[PDB]
């Protein structure tokens, strides 16, 4: 019953700079014994979490003193300096002190770079998927930062959002752009009644958007 | 060489029960306490329980009373049960032993690999796929992309290869959503257009749970 709050949710950061991740207790944290529990996790995509940080001050065997910990009683924070690719995921705070133990909620670490726009590709639906009785129509905007980016449906240039599903990939540790994939399903009925498809992506790298379009014939 | 490593069964019905076996290595259970902890899809963490290296427990508040936590000393071994399953306890589950070896942990040490638990009432479906080709109406230069579509699966997952890996020459690999209960995600891969339709470029879906590899021809029109 022991709430941690971490903030920011997610935290942009210039490599080679300074980031700053904090945690506060809903309740003060301290043991009368003067002990403090606090330990920091990091896990980076598609890993399990690593201890940081242990005693609100410590740092773990191997992990490089640009890692920092401080705090008080409820008011605890992660510096991490001179930030590099690998430094990317989730910050999770942790309190093992009052039973139960608990997490924050967790801290993307996102790496900021130059704006850059989507490349859009359209896809009609493959002939094999209308004999199934589907009809899905897909747009790829790969390589875009920063991660905002809206995605548009038009069918004879009217708005669809019916059917709509969409999935951005989390940050590329090469160049740090994300990738979206929107999908249009329709039954190939509903499909074979129109002529244009038209996916239009608003990204702030321009107030055009960018459209991308075919028709059946 | 301290290690652990989570065995779990995959797929379980939304009432049946869960039972993951942690087995450990490089360290002795009489010594350590072992933690588990959980992540559902997209979210953060959660402690779920403890078992000290003495033999008692400590369970999570929301789950304390489907809970249990066992162990075998002699065969390295922690086992987490858990009754009545929810639809929310699709997670990938951990285990984790305490840095500490006394009854207050300074930390979690090593952690297991984690494993995948999906709890839901559908079956194991095979993919279908199906290939994401440009229009014969939108000619461009330097590069093309090209997609395959893996749609109406599960369990979770799938692994798209392109040309025998020969291509990690930006693959974009879509995280699945659910849809109709069933899961749907897509890759991209982008190549110089002067190789395709020119050379041959083919996706390989591989859905480990249903045993069944399906491969296809990226072809104009
Ligand atoms: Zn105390
Ligand atoms: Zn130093
Ligand atoms: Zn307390
Ligand atoms: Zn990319
Ligand atoms: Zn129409
Ligand atoms: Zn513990
Ligand atoms: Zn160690």
């Known amino acids: 019953e022991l709430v941690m709050t971490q903030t920011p949710l997610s935290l942009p950061v210039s490599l080679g700079d300074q980031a700053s991740i904090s945690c506060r207790s809903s309740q003060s944290i301290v043991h009368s014994n003067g002990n403090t529990y606090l330990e920091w996790y990091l896990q980076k995509p598609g890993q399990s979490p690593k201890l940081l940080i242990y005693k609100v001050s410590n740092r773990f065997s191997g992990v490089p003193d640009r890692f920092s910990g401080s705090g008080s009683g409820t008011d605890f924070t992660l510096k991490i300096n001179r930030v590099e690719a690998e430094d990317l995921g989730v910050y999770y705070c942790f309190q093992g002190s009052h039973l139960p133990p608990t997490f924050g909620g967790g801290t993307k670490l996102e790496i900021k770079r130059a704006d850059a726009a989507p490349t859009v590709s359209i896809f009609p639906p493959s002939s094999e998927q209308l004999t199934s009785g589907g009809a899905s129509v897909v747009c790829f905007l790969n390589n875009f930062y920063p991660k905002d980016i809206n995605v548009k449906w038009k069918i004879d240039g009217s708005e669809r959002q019916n059917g709509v599903l969409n999935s951005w990939t989390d940050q590329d540790s090469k160049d740090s752009t994300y990738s979206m994939s929107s999908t249009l399903t329709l039954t190939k009925d509903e499909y074979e009644r129109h002529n244009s498809y038209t996916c239009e992506a608003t990204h702030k790298t321009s107030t055009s958007p960018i459209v991308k379009s075919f028709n059946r014939n | 060489q301290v290690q652990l490593k989570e065995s779990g069964p995959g797929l379980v019905a939304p009432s049946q029960s869960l039972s993951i076996t942690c087995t450990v290595s490089?360290?002795?259970?009489?010594?350590?306490?072992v933690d588990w902890v959980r992540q559902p899809p997209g979210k953060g963490l959660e402690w779920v329980g403890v078992?000290?290296?003495?033999?008692?427990?400590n369970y999570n508040s929301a789950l304390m009373s489907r809970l249990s936590i066992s162990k075998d000393n002699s065969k390295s071994q922690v086992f987490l049960k858990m009754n009545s399953l929810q639809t929310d306890d699709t997670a990938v589950y951990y285990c984790?032993?305490?840095?500490?070896?006394?009854?207050?942990?300074?930390?979690?040490?090593?952690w297991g690999q984690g494993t995948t638990v999906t709890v839901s009432s559908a079956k194991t479906t095979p993919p279908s796929v199906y290939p994401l080709a440009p229009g014969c109406g939108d000619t461009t230069g330097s590069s093309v992309t090209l997609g395959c579509l893996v749609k109406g699966y599960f369990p979770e997952p799938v692994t798209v290869t392109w040309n025998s890996g020969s291509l990690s020459s930006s693959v974009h690999t879509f995280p699945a959503l659910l849809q109709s209960g069933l899961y749907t995600m897509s890759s991209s891969v982008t190549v110089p257009s002067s190789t395709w339709p020119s050379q041959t470029v083919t996706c390989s879906v591989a859905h480990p749970a249903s045993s069944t590899t399906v491969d296809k021809k990226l072809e104009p029109r």
């Open positions: 078992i000290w290296s003495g033999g008692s427990t």
């Open positions: 984790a032993k305490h840095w500490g070896g006394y009854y207050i942990p300074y930390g979690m040490d090593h």
């Open positions: 490089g360290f002795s259970l009489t010594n350590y306490g």
